[PDB]
């Protein structure tokens, strides 16, 4: 919004970035500290990318560039908190007796050799007749 | 019939039960008077054919009221292209020894035209399957006439939506899949030859007979039926054919 | 004879057409459409067009989710045992139909405040011998987003409303401009419509 | 219109674009923001895709962004209302007309035969049982 | 936020004639775009979920009988029931169906009018086991009074008492279509044994004089 | 531990698989030898595409596998 | 047709949190607004907020901000509502609903209703104190009786007379609350032929406490 008889004039938000259309420079020229300018600038073009509720589990959103950055919290992996896994195989060592394979935060149990596991995972049982 | 319900007495009149030594063997479907349809693999290793009895109109196994008309079976006819011990061309037409008098609890279900079955009675997807089959994959045969509503699938959907188990028979053009993939509703073991009848505008038509299926309503699987449209004309020709002195004869097909 | 592919629903205001790419050489097409647990309704029989209308079926129940498939009959004839086909993406009209480009109906400066009415375009969804207006199908889910500015140097000052009317104060110094944009915030895709034709006083 | 080298006076959007047919350059000079100029251009210089009256058989065309929508009459369908709905009464019309059996007769509208044990009625499309027990009809439900 | 004012809080009517109801609204519900008034009516027989009655203030939901009828435009809306039957006895709720947040009305109880009858009030001294446990809850009953409005005046040794008392009213009965208030005043041993005479007064529209029922501690 | 049971010293290879039910959906009470229970007991046969442990009666049930 | 099967009834201690569910069947789950309505007795209806499944958009009533949270899982076609830090004001009957067809067309289909109770009371059977008239020199053809039920929790309790035979002519008053307890009575009027006469008892059954008391009305109160 570099209209005639401007710039040398004192800075103003509304008179530049709302009445008419200010640029990024005219942005900082009013707000100085770059972070706070972004606080407005990420709204000016990219209207609001998280005015819906995409990231579940009460995902707070900062809404910077149009990439839709959202803060996720503990107990839920992923940026949108959508991955509902219990953080590990450590819960009852995989609902089991010995341990659980941590194959990318999945639930795949196993027991020791000669102590064959059930299909879904339970107490280890001897395999043969004299294990 | 896992996940099925009880067919109220008479609401499944075309259903026909077959007994060998009085023991449950298969289902069936009465067409007009003396001709019944049951899957071809029902009668494979049965000796003493004279002990083949077809009770029709039955509703409750553990009871004998006045609605169970029982007639013998003189001759069974199967396609010659059928191979013993296999699944292709699983359909048989039976020449009942004596005609049966129809009643309220005995109404016969008959075939549609080949073009009609190919064009209209294949795009309804909501058709009943009835029988006295087991209620579990290991087995608990229901003494009551169970019925079940099933969905319909074309052969490509069945292949690309179910599981990819390699140890299963292929799906020929003579057979088409049916059943729920989740594993809640599927005929189990006593429903071979059981009618798979599709309702269409106040009239039921025989559009399939239960033939096989990997297990009973397993994860990602369907029960393969027998598309009767391939055999409508052959049944129509054999039905109006002269009686023959055989017992188990394999009529030419096509 | 080859199967179809790149099936897509080009729908706006519930005017749904199903289109597929491969050209019909020695080959004709037919398409069926059905709901999750409905009956397969066949349409566009043996047609050589690479597209087929389906508005008259989704208009029956817009809220349901629809599934469609397209066979390929060899030219001249049926098939051997089964036609070769290809399904289509599941299309729920209510959540997916594109919103038509809105039009501004009127605008008047009462006092120092303007009043930008928005014309309500009708949709293909029918009722008892009449088409249903856009408001009549969506209701509360339909909000608007007006942009006004000075003629020179633009300066879109966005605004929102839940009605076909607007009441916004101005500086009484220059003839503002208007551009409305029908927005459904309850969707996930196709939320915002294309901007209205610009209108200034 | 009034040229007089117009580029001195700051041109109002109305005067330059929504009055005379402005080019992209004029609009870019006015808005002074490339992004918004592109959006306004695609919405404004889109044009009326309805100058060829694409809809037949009495259909109200409606312009959109590089698109048109035909508001077809009840007796028609198609993207341009091209298809006669009432002229697709052949046997593949989900068993078109006939309740029991349709046959694609050559050169004539389909004929409704129907199964043994039934017989046609005056309507000529559906038929009713003629015996005590027809095919696949449950008399318990009557 | 829109406030909705069901003008009759609780109206009574003999089964058979025509009733009319009102439900005002602060902000007008008429959308000028398509000239529809976005208010919904509901019928809720007690103990049952509220079945929908009429949407858009004029359109019957599929299955609603053909006697319910909505009318009105703008801020005042009306629901009419013709030839009232026994099933119409319910509480009806209008709803703002235009702007979030959705706000319901205060409801409108429906009552079956019947020939009014004076209540049968009978006071009751405490039970024998009631004293031994350590309770002193004297209760005096009322039965078969119409209409609903009633008042009770508890007196202890001739002085009116309004502490620790409790009341309960039944819904309209099926046979007599009447309510039965129950006023109980609860004490413990010492206060009950510090004052002697107990009396409860039934002030009802049926008569200008409250019917008196009383007992004395000294005789019991 | 280490139970000393006869390994059945298989004389025929076909009677040595497990009880293959068969994908088909018919009921015929055939018989199979269970390698655990020392008996050629009864199992329900679907009627098609099974293994070679289907037996019409108990006589050949015994004959084919169990060393007579 | 369609139905909305909500969860069972709950009785939470203060400070706990309930989780009401509402399963949708018969229609397209992801294309209809699932409502929630609170109905405290003596307060009519009070809209809480709705969620559109699949999209996830929610619209909470302001007076329920934080208190009520709506989640939805479309794979099982059931909605969920969670009320946190329960108080005595949350003791009400909640519903779920499905929006109508042609836009803002009300709530076409309602759930059966769910009763939620929050109180610091304990599972206590009552001490039913019988009733009997005093002097009552009138003693007309009609005589009133009763058995006061106080000190029990939770509701409800069945009350009758003479093992249900004396069921015509009773007025079971609604269970009112006082001193963090429930109290109700049961007035029956009988002819003099049965009172003052042979045993006339009131039968009280508290299902929660598995209680069966048959205290009999006796003269000389
Ligand atoms: C009319 O105009 C549209 C767009 O230019 C075109 O698609 C039609 O083919 C024509 O009839
Ligand atoms: C536009 O809409 C269509 C349906 C027809 O009614 C036309 O006459 C009208 O101009
Ligand atoms: Ca400027
Ligand atoms: Ca500037
Ligand atoms: Ca500047
Ligand atoms: Ca300026
Ligand atoms: Ca500058
Ligand atoms: Ca500067
Ligand atoms: Ca029997
Ligand atoms: Ca000019
Ligand atoms: Ca220029
Ligand atoms: Ca110019
Ligand atoms: Ca210029
Ligand atoms: Ca255009
Ligand atoms: Mg300003
Ligand atoms: Mg102008
Ligand atoms: Mg210029
Ligand atoms: Mg220039």
CA distance C47 to C43: 9
Q: Residue A39: which residues within 8 A CB-CB, separation 6 or more?
A: none
CB contact set of B66 (below 8 Å; sequence gap of 6+): none
Question: Do residues G10 and G92 make contact, with C-beta atoms less than 8 angstroms apart?
Answer: no
CA–CA separation, G35 vs G95, rounded Å? Answer: 8
Q: How far is the CA of D130 from the centre of ligand 15 (A)?
A: 86
First CA to last CA distance, chain B: 32
Q: Which one is catalytic: B90, B181, B191, B221?
A: B90
- Tokens of residue B115, six digits: 């073009």
Q: Show Cβ contacts of residue C156 under 8 Å, excluding neighbours closer than 6 positions.
A: A21, C147, C148, C149, D36
Kindly give the pairing relationship between strand B248-251 and strand B69-79.
parallel
d(CA C67, CA E147): 60
Ligand 2 proximity of D73 Cβ (cutoff 6 Å): yes
Contacts of residue F52, defined as CB under 8 A and 6 or more positions apart, other chains included, come to F14, F15, F17
Residue F1 lies in a domain: no
Q: How far apart are CA A23 and CA A2, in angstroms?
A: 8
Helices A24-31 and A34-44 pack at an angle, to 10 degrees, of 140
Q: b/e map of C166-192 (b: 16 or more CB within 10 Å)? A: bebeeeeeeebbbbbbbbbbbbeeebe
Tell me whether residue B117 is one of the annotated catalytic residues.
no
Identify whether B89 is a catalytic site residue: no
Question: What does the block give as tokens for G6?
Answer: 């909500």
CATH architecture for segment(s) D89-142: Ribbon (2.10)
- Distances B52 to B195, C97, C126, E158, F47 between C-alpha atoms, Å: 19, 61, 60, 98, 17
For residues D22-44, one letter each, b for 16 or more C-beta atoms within 10 angstroms of the residue's C-beta and e for the rest, the string is beeebbbbbbbbeebbeebbebe
Q: Considering the domain boundaries, does residue G123 fall inside one?
A: no
- Using CA atoms, how far apart are residues G135 and E120, in angstroms rounded to an integer? 17
**B157 phi, psi to nearest 5 deg:** -60, -45
Q: Which residues contact D123 (CB under 8 A, 6 or more apart)?
A: none
Residues E123, B213: Cα–Cα separation, whole Å: 77
Q: How is domain E122-216 classified at the architecture level of CATH?
A: Sandwich (2.60)
Q: Is D49 in the pocket of ligand 1 (CB under 6 A)?
A: yes
| Distance between CA atoms of residues G46 and G26, nearest Å | 26
Encoded tokens for A119: 């299909």
CB C134 within 8 A of CB E36: no
Measured from the Cβ of residue B230, the count of other Cβ atoms closer than 10 Å reads: 21
Secondary structure of residue C123 in the 3-state scheme: strand
CA quadruple C111, C112, C115, C116: dihedral sign: positive
Segments of chain C assigned to CATH 2.60.40.10: 8-96, 104-196
CB B150 within 8 A of CB B179: yes
Q: Between B and C, how many CB-CB pairs are < 8 A? A: 27
Euclidean distance between CA atoms C49 and C53, whole angstroms: 11
- Examine domains B1-12+109-229 and B13-108+230-243 and report if their fold is the same: yes
Bridge partners of D64, per DSSP, are D67
In 3D space, the residue among E172, E17, E20 whose CA is nearest the CA of residue E108 turns out to be E20
End-to-end CA distance of chain C: 59
Phi, psi of C95 (to 5 degrees): -90, 0
Cα–Cα distance measured from residue D116 to residue C11, given in angstroms and rounded to the nearest whole number: 46
Q: Which structure tokens are listed for A41? A: 């600038």
The structure's method of determination equals cryo-EM
For G8-29, give the secondary structure using H, E and C: CCEEECCCCCEEEEEEEECCCH
Reduced to 3 states (helix: H, G, I; strand: E, B; else coil), residue G117 is strand
Q: 3-state class of F15 per DSSP?
A: helix
Strand partners, E24: E5, E76
Helix (H, G, I), strand (E, B) or coil at E88: helix
Q: Note the helical H segments in E20-140.
A: 128-133
Q: Please report residues of C whose CB lies closer than 8 A to that of A21.
A: 149, 153-156
Residue F6 domain flag: no
Question: Residue E55's beta-bridge partner residues?
Answer: E59
Spacing, Cα A43 to ligand 8 middle (Å) = 22
Q: How many CA atoms lie within 13 A of B250 on its CB side?
A: 12
- Architecture field, domain C8-96: Sandwich (2.60)
Same domain? G112 vs G137: no
Dist CA E111 CA E118 (whole Å) = 18
- DSSP assignment of G85-97 equals S--GGG-EEEEEE
User: Residue B8: how many CA atoms within 13 Å on its side-chain side?
Assistant: 5
Say if ligand 2 is within 6 A of residue D44 CB. no
* Beta carbons of E90 and E45 less than 8 angstroms apart: yes
For residue E78, CA distances in Å to A18, B39, D105, E68, E108 come to 47, 66, 60, 11, 12
Which CATH superfamily groups domain C104-196? Immunoglobulins (2.60.40.10)
For C45, the token pair is: 């029989």
Helices (H), B23-96: none
- Which fold does the domain B1-12+109-229 belong to in CATH? Thrombin, subunit H (2.40.10)
Residue B230: CA atoms inside 13 Å, Cβ hemisphere, count?
22
G110 domain-assigned: yes
Distance CA D29, CA D36 (A): 12
Please, which residues bridge with residue G164 across strands?
Answer: none
Q: G110 and G7 share a domain?
A: yes
Whether the CB-CB separation of C56 and C40 falls below 8 Å is answered with no
Q: Indicate if G12 and G90 belong to the same structural domain.
A: yes
Residue G193 has φ and ψ, to the nearest 5°, of -65, -30
What is d(CA B12, CA B29) in angstroms, rounded to the nearest whole number? Answer: 10
Coil, strand or helix at C18: strand
> Measured between alpha carbons, how far is residue C6 from residues B15, C42, G110, G134 in Å?
45, 19, 41, 91
Output the 3-class SS for D73-124: CCCEECCCCCEEHHHCCCCCCCCCCCCCCCECCCCCCCECCCCCCEEECCCC
Query: Within 13 Å and on the Cβ side, how many CA atoms surround G70?
Result: 27
Residue F31 within any structural domain of the chain = yes
Instruction: Strand C8-12: give its sheet, edge to edge.
Output: C8-12, C15-19, C51-53
Kindly list the distances between the CA atom of residue F4 and the CA atoms of A39, A130, C72, F8, in Å, as whole numbers in the listed order: 81, 11, 67, 12
Could you give the CA distance from residue D19 to residue D41 in angstroms, rounded to a whole number?
Answer: 15
Cβ(C117)–Cβ(C107) below 8 Å: yes
Which phi and psi (to 5°) does residue C106 adopt?
A: -160, 170
Architecture of domain E4-112: Sandwich (2.60)
Residue F45 sits in a domain of what CATH number? 4.10.410.10
What is the C-alpha separation between B35 and A118, in angstroms, rounded? Answer: 51
Strands B204-210 and B195-199: antiparallel
Tokens 């989704």 — which residue? C58
Angle at E28 between CA E24 and CA E31, to 5 degrees: 135
For residue B68, give the nearest of B16, B2, B112 by alpha carbon: B16
Which domains are present in chain A?
A: 1-45 (no CATH), 46-84 (2.10.25.10), 85-131 (2.10.25.10)
Vertex C80: Cα angle to C78 and C84 (nearest 5): 85
Resolution, in Å, please?
3.7
Contacts across the A-C interface (CB distance below 8 Å) = 23
Question: What is the DSSP secondary structure assignment for residue G3, as one 8-state letter?
Answer: E
Q: Which residues contact A124 (CB under 8 A, 6 or more apart)?
A: A97, A98, A111, A112, A115, A116, A117
What gap in Å lies between CA G182 and CA G173, rounded to an integer?
12
**Which residue segment(s) compose the domain that F22 sits in?**
14-65
Strand positions, DSSP E, chain C: 8-12, 15-19, 27-34, 41-47, 51-53, 67-74, 86-87, 104-110, 113-118, 122-127, 130-133, 144-148, 157-161, 168-169, 177-178, 199-200
Token duo for residue B147 = 């019925």
- β-sheet with E182-185: strand ranges across: E122-124, E138-141, E182-185, E165-166
Q: Is G57–A56 a contact, with Cβ atoms under 8 angstroms apart? A: no
H or E stretch covering G183: strand G182-184
Query: Based on the structure, what is the number of domains in chain G?
Result: 2
Instruction: Say whether B90 is catalytic.
Output: yes
The helix/strand/coil state of F60 is helix
Chain E environment of G187 (Cβ under 8 Å) = 141, 143, 180, 182
Beta strands in chain B (DSSP E): 5-6, 16-20, 23-26, 35-38, 52-56, 69-79, 92-96, 127-131, 146-150, 177-178, 195-199, 204-210, 223-226, 248-251
Q: How far is E139 from G136, CA to CA, in rounded Å?
A: 15
* E99 contacts E27 by C-beta, under 8 angstroms: yes
Contact C153 A20 (CB under 8 A): yes
Choosing among 2.10.25.10, 2.60.40.1930, 3.20.130.10, 3.40.50.10420, the CATH entry for D47-88 is 2.10.25.10
Q: Which of E80, E73, E59 is nearest to E8 (CA)?
A: E80
What is the extent of the structural domain holding G24?
3-118
Q: How far apart are the first and last CA of chain A?
A: 84
> Which residues on neighbouring strands pair with residue C142, listed in sequence order?
none
Query: Which candidate, E165, E171, E159, E162, places its Cα nearest to that of E197?
Result: E159
Domain-located, residue F9: no
Peptide bond into A44 cis (omega under 30): no
Pairing of strands E19-25, E4-6: antiparallel
Judged by CB atoms within 8 Å, which residues 9-38 of E form the interface with C? 31-34, 36, 38
Strands A99-101 and B195-199: unpaired
**Do B118 and D94 meet the contact criterion of CB atoms below 8 Å apart?**
no
- Six token digits for residue G127: 């001490």
Contact C44, C125 (CB under 8 A): no
Ligand having the closest approach to the CA of C171: 15
Q: Of C19, E94, A81, E155, give the one whose Cα is nearest residue G106.
A: E94
Contact between C155 and A21 using a beta-carbon 8 Å cutoff: yes
A128 CB within 8 Å of a chain F CB? no
**Alpha carbon of F65 to ligand 15 centroid (Å):** 100
Handedness of CA B69, B74, B77, B83 (dihedral sign): positive
CB C151 within 8 A of CB C200: yes
Query: Angle at the Cα of G77 (from G73 to G78), degrees rounded to 5?
Result: 70
Give kind and range of the element (H or E) at residue E36: strand E36-37
CA E111 vs CA E10, G39, G172: distances in Å: 7, 20, 19
Q: How far is A111 from chain C (nearest CA, A)?
A: 43
Q: Calculate the CA C143 to chain-centre distance.
A: 16
Return residues 3-62 of F near A (CB < 8 Å). 3
Question: How many angstroms separate the CA atoms of C151 and C140, rounded?
Answer: 32
Q: DSSP letter at C91?
A: B
- Contact criterion met (CB below 8 Å) for C65 and C35: yes
How far apart are alpha carbons G33 and G99 in whole angstroms? 5
Residue F35 lies in a domain: yes
Residues 6 or more apart whose CB falls under 8 angstroms from that of B175 comprise B87, B88, B90, B211, B224, B225, B226, B227
Q: How far is the CA of D131 from the centre of ligand 1 (A)?
A: 59
CATH classification at residue G183: 2.60.40.10
Residue D13: what are its φ and ψ, rounded to 5°? -55, -40
- Domain total for chain F? 1
Among candidate residues G66, G83, G118, the one where a domain is terminated:
G118
Q: In angstroms, rounded to a whole number, what is the distance separating the alpha carbons of residues A16 and A28?
A: 12
Domain spans of chain E? 4-112, 122-216
Q: What is the distance between the alpha carbons of residues B159 and B221, in angstroms, rounded to a whole number?
A: 10
Q: For residue G31, with 0-12 CB atoms within 10 Å meaning exposed, 13-18 middle and 19 or more buried, which class applies?
A: buried
Q: Which CATH number fits domain B13-108+230-243: 3.40.50.1450, 2.40.10.10, 3.40.50.1970, 3.40.309.10?
A: 2.40.10.10
């Amino acid at each position: 919004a570099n209209s005639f008889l401007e710039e040398m004039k004192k800075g103003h938000l509304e008179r530049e970035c709302m009445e008419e259309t200010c640029s990024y420079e005219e942005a900082r020229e009013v707000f100085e500290d770059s972070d706070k300018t972004n606080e407005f600038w990420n709204k000016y073009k990219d209207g609001d990318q998280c005015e819906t509720s995409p990231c579940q589990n009460q995902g707070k959103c900062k809404d910077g560039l149009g990439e839709y950055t959202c803060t996720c919290l503990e107990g839920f992996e992923g940026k949108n908190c959508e991955l509902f896994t219990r953080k590990l195989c450590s819960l009852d060592n995989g609902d089991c007796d010995q341990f659980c394979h941590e194959e990318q935060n999945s639930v795949v149990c196993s027991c020791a050799r000669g102590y064959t596991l059930a299909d879904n995972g339970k107490a280890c049982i001897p395999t043969g007749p004299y294990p | 019939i896992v996940g099925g319900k009880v067919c109220p007495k008479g609401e499944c009149p075309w259903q026909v039960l077959l007994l060998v030594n009085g023991a449950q063997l298969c289902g069936g479907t009465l067409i007009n008077t003396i001709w019944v349809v049951s899957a071809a693999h029902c009668f494979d290793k049965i000796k003493n054919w004279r002990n083949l009895i077809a009770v029709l109109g039955e509703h409750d196994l553990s009871e004998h009221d006045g609605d169970e008309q029982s007639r013998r079976v003189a001759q069974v006819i199967i396609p010659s292209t059928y191979v013993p011990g296999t699944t292709n061309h699983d359909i048989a037409l039976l020449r009942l020894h004596q005609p049966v008098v129809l009643t309220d609890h005995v109404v016969p279900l008959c075939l549609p035209e080949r073009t009609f079955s190919e064009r209209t009675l294949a795009f309804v997807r909501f058709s009943l399957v009835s029988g006295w089959g087991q209620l579990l994959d290991r087995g608990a045969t229901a003494l009551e006439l169970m019925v079940l509503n099933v969905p319909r699938l074309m052969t490509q959907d069945c292949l690309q939506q179910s599981r990819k188990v390699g140890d299963s028979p292929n799906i020929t053009e003579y057979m088409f899949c049916a059943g729920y993939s989740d594993g809640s509703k599927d005929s189990c073991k006593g429903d071979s030859g059981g009618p798979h009848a599709t309702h269409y505008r106040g009239t039921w038509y025989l559009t399939g007979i239960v033939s096989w299926g990997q297990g009973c309503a397993t994860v990602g699987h369907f029960g393969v039926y027998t598309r009767v449209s391939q055999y409508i004309e052959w049944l129509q020709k054999l039905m109006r054919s002269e009686p023959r002195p055989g017992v188990l004869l394999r009529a030419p097909f096509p | 004879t080859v199967a179809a592919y790149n099936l897509t629903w080009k729908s706006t205001n519930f005017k749904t057409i199903l289109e597929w790419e491969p050209k019909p050489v020695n080959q004709v097409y037919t398409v069926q459409i059905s709901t999750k647990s409905g009956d397969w309704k066949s349409k566009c029989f043996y047609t050589t067009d690479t597209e087929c209308d389906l508005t008259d079926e989704i208009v029956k129940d817009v809220k349901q989710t629809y599934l469609a498939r397209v066979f390929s009959y060899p030219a001249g004839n049926g098939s051997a045992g089964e036609p070769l086909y290809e399904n289509s993406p599941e299309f729920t009209p209510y959540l997916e139909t594109n919103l038509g480009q809105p039009t501004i109906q009127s605008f008047e400066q009462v006092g120092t405040k303007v009043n930008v009415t928005v014309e309500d375009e009708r949709t293909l969804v029918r009722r008892n011998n009449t088409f249903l207006s856009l408001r009549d199908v969506f209701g509360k889910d339909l909000i608007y987003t007006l942009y006004y500015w000075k003629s020179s140097s633009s300066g879109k000052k966005t605004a929102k409303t839940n009605t076909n009317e607007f009441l916004i104060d101005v500086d009484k110094g220059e003839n503002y401009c208007f551009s409305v944009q029908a927005v459904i915030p309850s969707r996930t895709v196709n939320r915002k419509s294309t901007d209205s034709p610009v209108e200034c006083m | 219109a009034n040229a007089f080298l117009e580029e001195l006076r700051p041109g109002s959007l109305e005067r330059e674009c929504k009055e005379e047919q402005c080019s992209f350059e004029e609009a870019r000079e006015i808005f002074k923001d490339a992004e918004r100029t592109k959006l306004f251009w695609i919405s404004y210089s889109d044009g009326d895709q309805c100058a060829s009256s694409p809809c037949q058989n009495g259909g109200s065309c409606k312009d959109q962004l590089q698109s048109y929508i035909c508001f077809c009459l009840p007796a028609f369908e198609g993207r341009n209302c091209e298809t006669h709905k009432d002229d697709q009464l052949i046997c593949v019309n989900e068993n078109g007309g006939c309740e029991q059996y349709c046959s694609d007769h050559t050169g004539t509208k389909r004929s409704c035969r129907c199964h043994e044990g039934y017989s046609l009625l005056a309507d000529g499309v559906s038929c009713t049982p003629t015996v005590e027990y027809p095919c696949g009809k449950i008399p318990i439900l009557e | 936020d829109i406030v909705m004012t069901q003008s009759p809080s609780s109206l009574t009517v003999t089964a058979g004639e025509k009733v009319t109801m009102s439900c005002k609204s602060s902000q007008s519900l008429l959308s000028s775009g398509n000239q529809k008034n976005y208010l919904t009516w509901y019928q809720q027989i007690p103990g049952q979920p509220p079945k929908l009655l009429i949407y858009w203030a004029s359109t019957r939901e599929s299955g609603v009988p053909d006697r319910f009828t909505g009318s009105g435009s703008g801020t005042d809306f009306t629901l009419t029931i013709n030839s009232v039957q026994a099933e119409d006895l319910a509480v009806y709720y209008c709803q703002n169906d235009y702007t979030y947040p959705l706000t319901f009305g205060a409801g409108t109880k429906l009552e079956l009018k019947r020939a009014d009858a004076a209540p049968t009030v009978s006071i009751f001294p405490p039970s024998s086991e009631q004293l031994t446990s350590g309770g002193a809850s004297v209760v005096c009953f009322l039965n078969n009074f119409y209409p609903k409005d009633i008042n009770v005046k508890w007196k202890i040794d001739g002085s009116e008492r309004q502490n620790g008392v409790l009341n309960s009213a039944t819904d309209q009965d099926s046979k007599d279509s009447t309510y039965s208030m129950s006023s109980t005043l609860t004490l413990t041993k010492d206060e009950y044994e510090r004052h002697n005479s107990y009396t409860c007064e039934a002030t009802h529209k049926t008569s200008t004089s409250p019917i008196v029922k009383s007992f004395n501690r000294n005789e019991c | 531990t280490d139970t000393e049971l006869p390994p059945l010293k298989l004389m025929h290879s076909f009677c040595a698989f497990k009880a293959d039910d068969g994908p088909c959906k018919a009921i015929m009470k055939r018989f199979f030898f269970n390698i655990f229970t020392r008996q050629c007991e009864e199992f329900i046969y679907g009627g098609c595409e099974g293994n070679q442990n289907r037996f019409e009666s108990l006589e050949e049930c015994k004959k084919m596998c169990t060393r007579d | 047709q369609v139905h909305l099967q909500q969860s069972g009834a709950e009785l939470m201690k203060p400070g706990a949190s309930v989780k009401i569910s509402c399963k949708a069947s018969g229609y397209t789950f992801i294309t209809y607004w699932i409502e929630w309505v609170k109905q405290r007795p003596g307060h009519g209806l009070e809209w809480i907020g709705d969620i559109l499944p699949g999209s996830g958009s929610t619209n909470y009533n302001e007076n329920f901000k934080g208190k009520a949270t709506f989640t939805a899982d479309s794979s099982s076609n059931t909605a969920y509502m969670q009320l946190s830090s329960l108080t005595s004001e949350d003791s009400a009957v909640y519903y779920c609903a499905r929006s109508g067809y042609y836009g803002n067309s009300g709530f076409a289909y309602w759930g059966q209703g769910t009763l939620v109770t929050v109180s610091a009371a304990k599972t206590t059977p009552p001490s039913v104190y019988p009733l009997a008239p005093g002097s009552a020199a009138q003693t007309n053809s009609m005589v009133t009786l009763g058995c006061l039920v106080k000190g029990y929790f939770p509701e409800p309790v069945t009350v009758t007379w003479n093992s249900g035979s004396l069921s015509s002519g009773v007025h079971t008053f609604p269970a009112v609350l006082q001193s963090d307890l429930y109290t109700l009575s049961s007035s029956v009027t009988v002819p003099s032929s049965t009172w003052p006469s042979e045993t006339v008892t009131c039968n009280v059954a508290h299902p929660a406490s598995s209680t069966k008391v048959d205290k009999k009305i006796v003269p000389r109160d």
